[PDB]
Design a protein around this ligand. Structure first.
Ligand SMILES: NC(=O)c1cccc2c(N[C@H](CN3CCC3)c3ccc(Cl)c(C(F)(F)F)c3)ncnc12
Length: 312
């Protein structure tokens, strides 16, 4: 429980609680740094979908161990709070790397999109959907591989720039939305901007719903092609929208230089290497958050929420 963890830093904040950087104190894994995520039970239980959703996240981070998905090392509770201990992803938000770098070289984008396309594959086999591939929602670990992290209540629910039309029309949707999203993510990577904007939210949607795609000349034919098959407004036919799913996608010429087995084993050199002078090094995050002093102010429905990662 809470006592074992010393709050080193604030890494993220929101309506529902906070994400803390903390070093464990007692027992082995003593000294080891983690990320602590704390939700107020208060704000979750007064809504229906919120509670199920928090619980889904709880059960998904357990059912799903996979190279490219934030792990759960402990989970537990108290009075009015919810605690998850995740590995601490010092690589920060893909969002940040994209700002620091401004734009990505193709084979740079290719490496991230590849790794990501594998977590969707994995996720889709457990009949799980990720919905949102904004760079904000994607993190890097210490060695700089990708980590999908957001499976629960979101951090507020943010920009819509990376949402397929079927979600924005609420017409009903499936695992296909992810491939639309992946395309939008890709396009942004290669051009420095989401495929649709967007004086404002209202107009952005109109674009995402109505406008023709815009493929700059400096885009290689394969990339021009992926973007087009992935940003398909008709879902039935959006690449990846078939029984083969992730497979249909990974098998596009864009990904011809990818060794899926080495990639999965984290043996492909990440295009960028988090610069860490230490385990707790946070110079990859945003001193907007890291500056602040880390404080944890003090018939439930969250049964056997507690959790402990098997060996270790
Ligand atoms: N594991 C880490 O090292 C680590 C380090 C920093 C942030 C996160 C994080 N933050 C997500 C936001 N995701 C990160 C990209 C978009 C998040 C989700 C729900 C909530 Cl309520 C919050 C909170 F408001 F801060 F509590 C944050 N989620 C998971 N691990 C993190």
């Amino acid at each position: 429980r809470p006592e074992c963890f010393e709050l080193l830093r604030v890494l993220g904040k929101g309506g529902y609680g906070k994400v803390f950087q903390v070093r464990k104190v007692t027992g082995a894994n003593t000294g080891k740094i983690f990320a602590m995520k704390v939700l107020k039970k208060a704000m979750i239980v007064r809504n229906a979908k919120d509670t199920a959703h928090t619980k889904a996240e709880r059960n998904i981070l357990e059912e799903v161990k996979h190279p490219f998905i934030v792990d759960l090392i402990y989970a537990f509770q108290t009075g009015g709070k919810l605690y998850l201990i995740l590995e601490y992803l010092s690589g920060g938000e893909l969002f940040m790397q994209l700002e620091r770098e401004g734009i990505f070289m193709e084979d740079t984008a290719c490496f991230y999109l590849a790794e990501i396309s594998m977590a969707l594959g994995h996720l889709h086999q457990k009949g799980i959907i990720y919905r949102d591939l904004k760079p904000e929602n994607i993190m890097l670990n210490h060695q700089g591989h990708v980590k999908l992290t957001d499976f629960g209540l979101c951090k507020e629910c943010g920009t819509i720039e990376y949402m397929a039309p079927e979600i924005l029309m609420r017409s009903g949707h499936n695992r296909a939305v992810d491939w639309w999203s992946l395309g939008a993510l890709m396009y942004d990577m290669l051009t420095g901007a989401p495929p649709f904007t967007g004086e404002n939210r209202k107009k952005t949607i109109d674009k995402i719903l109505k406008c023709k795609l815009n493929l700059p000349p400096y885009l290689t034919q394969e990339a021009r092609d992926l973007l087009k098959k992935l940003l398909k407004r008709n879902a039935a036919s959006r690449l990846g929208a078939g029984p083969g799913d992730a497979g249909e996608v990974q098998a596009h010429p864009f990904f011809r230089h990818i060794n899926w087995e080495e990639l999965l084993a984290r043996k492909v050199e990440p295009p960028f290497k988090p610069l860490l002078q230490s385990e707790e090094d946070v110079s990859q995050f945003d001193s907007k958050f890291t500056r602040q002093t880390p404080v944890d102010s003090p018939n439930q429905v969250f049964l056997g929420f507690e959790y402990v990662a098997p060996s270790v």
